[PDB]
Enzyme design. Structure first.
Site, PDB file in Angstrom:
ATOM      1  N   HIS A 126       0.758  -1.244   0.000  1.00  0.00           N
ATOM      2  CA  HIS A 126       0.000   0.000   0.000  1.00  0.00           C
ATOM      3  C   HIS A 126       0.794   1.303   0.000  1.00  0.00           C
ATOM      4  O   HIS A 126       0.197   2.370  -0.077  1.00  0.00           O
ATOM      5  CB  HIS A 126      -1.001   0.003   1.168  1.00  0.00           C
ATOM      6  N   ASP A 170      -9.705  -0.866   4.465  1.00  0.00           N
ATOM      7  CA  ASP A 170      -8.513  -1.418   5.074  1.00  0.00           C
ATOM      8  C   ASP A 170      -8.770  -1.804   6.520  1.00  0.00           C
ATOM      9  O   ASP A 170      -9.702  -1.303   7.151  1.00  0.00           O
ATOM     10  CB  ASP A 170      -7.444  -0.327   5.019  1.00  0.00           C
ATOM     11  N   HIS A 203      -6.435  -1.321   8.455  1.00  0.00           N
ATOM     12  CA  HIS A 203      -5.568  -0.284   8.994  1.00  0.00           C
ATOM     13  C   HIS A 203      -5.789   1.102   8.379  1.00  0.00           C
ATOM     14  O   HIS A 203      -6.280   1.223   7.261  1.00  0.00           O
ATOM     15  CB  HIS A 203      -4.119  -0.723   8.781  1.00  0.00           C
ATOM     16  N   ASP A 224      -3.235   3.313   7.938  1.00  0.00           N
ATOM     17  CA  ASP A 224      -2.043   3.620   7.159  1.00  0.00           C
ATOM     18  C   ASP A 224      -1.786   5.126   7.152  1.00  0.00           C
ATOM     19  O   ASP A 224      -1.355   5.702   6.145  1.00  0.00           O
ATOM     20  CB  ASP A 224      -2.200   3.128   5.719  1.00  0.00           C
ATOM     21  N   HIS A 230       4.394   1.156   4.027  1.00  0.00           N
ATOM     22  CA  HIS A 230       3.086   0.720   3.551  1.00  0.00           C
ATOM     23  C   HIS A 230       2.011   1.061   4.576  1.00  0.00           C
ATOM     24  O   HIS A 230       0.819   0.890   4.318  1.00  0.00           O
ATOM     25  CB  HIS A 230       3.082  -0.786   3.212  1.00  0.00           C
ATOM     26  N   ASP A 246      -7.306  -2.354   0.273  1.00  0.00           N
ATOM     27  CA  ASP A 246      -6.310  -3.236   0.856  1.00  0.00           C
ATOM     28  C   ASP A 246      -7.027  -4.563   1.087  1.00  0.00           C
ATOM     29  O   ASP A 246      -8.023  -4.629   1.817  1.00  0.00           O
ATOM     30  CB  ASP A 246      -5.810  -2.709   2.193  1.00  0.00           C
ATOM     31  N   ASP A 263      -6.437  -6.825   2.948  1.00  0.00           N
ATOM     32  CA  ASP A 263      -6.595  -7.200   4.350  1.00  0.00           C
ATOM     33  C   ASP A 263      -7.781  -6.541   5.044  1.00  0.00           C
ATOM     34  O   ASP A 263      -8.000  -6.756   6.240  1.00  0.00           O
ATOM     35  CB  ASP A 263      -5.302  -6.971   5.162  1.00  0.00           C
ATOM     36  N   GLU A 282      -1.906  -5.206  -1.362  1.00  0.00           N
ATOM     37  CA  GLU A 282      -1.470  -6.166  -0.355  1.00  0.00           C
ATOM     38  C   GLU A 282      -1.743  -7.653  -0.538  1.00  0.00           C
ATOM     39  O   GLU A 282      -1.811  -8.390   0.446  1.00  0.00           O
ATOM     40  CB  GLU A 282      -1.968  -5.726   1.029  1.00  0.00           C
TER      41      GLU A 282
HETATM   42  N1  LIG Z   1      -0.262   0.155  11.900  1.00  0.00           N
HETATM   43  C1  LIG Z   1       0.720  -0.759  11.255  1.00  0.00           C
HETATM   44  C2  LIG Z   1      -0.059  -1.267  10.039  1.00  0.00           C
HETATM   45  S1  LIG Z   1       0.899  -2.373   9.012  1.00  0.00           S
HETATM   46  C3  LIG Z   1      -0.374  -2.692   7.800  1.00  0.00           C
HETATM   47  C4  LIG Z   1      -0.061  -1.968   6.496  1.00  0.00           C
HETATM   48  B1  LIG Z   1      -1.109  -2.187   5.375  1.00  0.00           B
HETATM   49  O1  LIG Z   1      -2.410  -1.690   5.725  1.00  0.00           O
HETATM   50  O2  LIG Z   1      -0.716  -1.510   4.179  1.00  0.00           O
HETATM   51  O3  LIG Z   1      -1.251  -3.595   5.035  1.00  0.00           O
HETATM   52  C5  LIG Z   1       2.064   0.004  10.945  1.00  0.00           C
HETATM   53  O4  LIG Z   1       2.292   1.167  11.176  1.00  0.00           O
HETATM   54  O5  LIG Z   1       2.989  -0.781  10.384  1.00  0.00           O
HETATM   55 MN   LIG Z   2      -3.127  -0.762   3.638  1.00  0.00          MN
HETATM   56 MN   LIG Z   3      -4.022  -3.179   5.828  1.00  0.00          MN
END
Ligand SMILES: N[C@@H](CSCC[B-](O)(O)O)C(=O)O
Ligand SMILES: [Mn+2]
Ligand SMILES: [Mn+2]
Ligand SMILES: N[C@@H](CSCC[B-](O)(O)O)C(=O)O
Ligand SMILES: N[C@@H](CSCC[B-](O)(O)O)C(=O)O
Ligand SMILES: [Mn+2]
Ligand SMILES: [Mn+2]
Ligand SMILES: [Mn+2]
Ligand SMILES: [Mn+2]
Lengths: 309, 309, 309
Positions: free
Chosen positions: A97, A120, A122, A124, A137, A228, A230, A273
């Protein structure tokens, strides 16, 4: 109709596991193009972006591969601006991402009025200074939001970046693992979000009606869906780098995308992702990929009630 | 109360896989009768229909076993009219959904005012001329709808058929794989349907309220629930001939049936497309069969809040 | 904030399988305390209650271990009244739900105005005379309800019990296997309940709004959440003694608890019926335990949108 502008983006340096590079390849091999062609839109394959590696790409503080992640989005941005110039929906089959930085930037250079829907698990929205993992990401939104400029340090690789989207123009759907700092930004900036808690209380039907009315209320405008994989539960998309339980159901992913298609305002799409090397079994990979294709297809008209010419 | 009129219908020539014949047998062996007896309705087992095979049953164009599929419904229709005559709910434990032709016909000969709720992943509204597979289990509704007479060619085996139900009197719940032609018929004729997209947007609660108000609004009237086991997700009813992901949950199947029971207007029920020879494992068969029995039981009063005399 | 008052209650004589004793231990070993500490509440571990066995505990009619089950709640009641006295939320990590008798009694001795939310697949409202299994883990509510005094025979072990909660003050969420007699009590006494049928029709969002308005309408007041792990579907909490299909989803369990936390009126919590010796595999045990901890954590502030200090 609405032309499709495919863009491969086999990049994985925005995070630790190199397999997400496999994304474009597996997505293609799953017959994505002929299926979109079976539907009703012109498919123009701009191929897969060749991201030449940066030999001496030293970290920025704790942020790794800043120069690789940055040039990757830079190339992608210019690439996305061209497909959007040839009057088409940009369709990026990326790796990690972090590429959203380029996807949304190159998109906004053509339609700066775009609104964003970020599906998502998350947010991000971490910055270089709040990040703890240092993986880019999980920081794309911070480089994009206008309200965070002034909080984003000048990181090697992102001098070209100009905050293109404001807090009031983005909506999150599916959150369930936001960092304490990310949550602070959500609440402080007042970003609209529908975490799993909201999806549970409103039901995906009211969620989609509310996010679309929130973005398409005052004025109609280009829509950028950054998806995303996920964002959906691991039982549907297990071959991803950061899976979290309690996610969007197979069906909820399709509703979201079927409703976005119907607005007729889709302008850019990111399918991110997906990492086949992370599936437990060969079917775990096939399950994650087919769900990703099914998702992409609904964005372009595939409806469960049926279709016909 | 409301008497039950059981009818076995071990027929599989409406489609390619012969295992659906196992249906009545496995459904019975699962203790369906004593469980309905444990509830509060009189169980009158009319036995299993003996469908003598038609030696020289040549195809009609691309349509296979037309004469077998047709006489199978013909017998069943006369059978259903008798149970409905002895004042009972006709309960057909069939093989392939092609039997719905007979089930609904024999039903309508007694109560021509009946309204239909079709729980299925498919519309089964293909005609002899639109069909591509040529399997009659995916064409029952076309032979039944009054608005399609004139479009249905005279197929060997169905001279007895008289379009008994009109477009305005049937409701679909659970659609997710409709043929391009079937979709054309849905939209052209204006048939009420709640595909998975709608179930996702309204929630099963609003879906059941709307389909019942749509059918029972103007006048109360006999209700025929034709239930295709594949209307539910493959994780709940995997032992079926044409499974599709994104289906009705275990719970949603029970709600539908618990709400239909409560109208007190159930008059005919079909429990179709269960094929044990198609379960991956012995538990896949047990899962599909028990979910089918649980479904049938809710149609006759079994409620999750509980029951008592 | 709101202090936590942890209480171990390794008791299993309210039912047949001795493994539920493992509950407190596994729940602790899963890092429950440090995770609650990672959040924002003071954790005061009152340890695990030592339930000395009653040598000659003969049955009462068909009711087994009446004296053990009774003294177990008696100790627990006095224990719960102390934590509630030190101004804290009583958190009982029990074995079998028969302990609810003591948990709610000792709770009500401090706040007799409390209202109860009972998340369970079962009503556990059987009396000594209606019970067929004779297991006390399915009769706790009968000993508690004021309207049932007069129907509860004097059972050895419960002379200390004084009906503390009235019919109008308790709400059930998740029912799907109520005994014919239990159903008679629900309907006769007019106890508010949201069985799976209701959860299906209203959606968990409207369910939580309605149960809270029903209990917190007239007056705000202490809330006792008695949570039976079997209230959730076996695919999420398989390591329990009486699992039933069609239960609350992982997500629905979290919503319930996240909404209860937000009222700011949580005063007592029971995390019951977890039995690791009943998990098919080591992961079935880990799945059941983590879902139980995730549940407990939402009761104390853990929100899916995120948190921060
Ligand atoms: N809050 C975590 C999230 S990692 C997930 C990233 B993604 O949404 O792109 O898969 C961090 O700062 O790495
Ligand atoms: Mn993401
Ligand atoms: Mn994610
Ligand atoms: N549209 C397909 C559907 S096959 C499914 C049939 B049935 O719903 O009865 O299982 C066809 O024409 O064969
Ligand atoms: N109705 C059953 C219920 S056993 C389930 C007990 B418990 O809810 O605590 O797990 C009985 O009377 O034993
Ligand atoms: Mn069918
Ligand atoms: Mn079907
Ligand atoms: Mn219980
Ligand atoms: Mn229970």
């Amino acid at each position: 109709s609405r032309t499709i502008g495919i863009i491969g983006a086999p990049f994985s340096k925005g995070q630790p596991r190199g397999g997400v590079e496999e994304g474009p390849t597996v997505l293609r091999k799953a017959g994505l193009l002929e299926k979109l062609k079976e539907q009703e839109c012109d498919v123009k394959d701009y191929g897969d972006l060749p991201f030449a590696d940066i030999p001496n790409d030293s970290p920025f503080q704790i942020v790794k591969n800043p120069r690789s992640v940055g040039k990757a989005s830079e190339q992608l941005a210019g690439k996305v601006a061209e497909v959007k110039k040839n009057g088409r929906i940009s369709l990026v089959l990326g790796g990690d991402h972090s590429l959203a930085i380029g996807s949304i930037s190159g998109h906004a250079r053509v339609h700066p009025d775009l609104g964003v829907i970020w599906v998502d698990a998350h947010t991000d929205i971490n910055t270089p200074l709040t990040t703890t993992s240092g993986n880019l990401h999980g920081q794309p939104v911070s480089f994009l939001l206008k309200e965070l400029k002034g909080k984003i340090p000048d990181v090697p690789g992102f001098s070209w970046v100009t905050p293109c989207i404001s807090a009031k123009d983005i909506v999150y759907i599916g959150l369930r693992d936001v960092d304490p700092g990310e949550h602070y930004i959500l609440k402080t900036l007042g970003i609209k979000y529908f975490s799993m808690t909201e999806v549970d209380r409103l039901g995906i039907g009211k969620v989609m009606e509310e996010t679309l009315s929130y973005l398409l209320g005052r004025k109609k405008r280009p829509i950028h869906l950054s998806f995303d994989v996920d964002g959906l539960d691991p039982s549907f998309t297990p071959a991803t780098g950061t899976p979290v339980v309690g996610g969007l159901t197979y069906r909820e992913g399709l509703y979201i995308t079927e409703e976005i298609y119907k607005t007729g305002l889709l302008s850019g799409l990111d399918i991110m992702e997906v990492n086949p090397s992370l599936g437990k079994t060969p079917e775990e990979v096939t399950r994650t990929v087919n769900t990703a294709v099914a998702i992409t297809l609904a964005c372009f008209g595939l409806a469960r009630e049926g279709n016909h010419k």
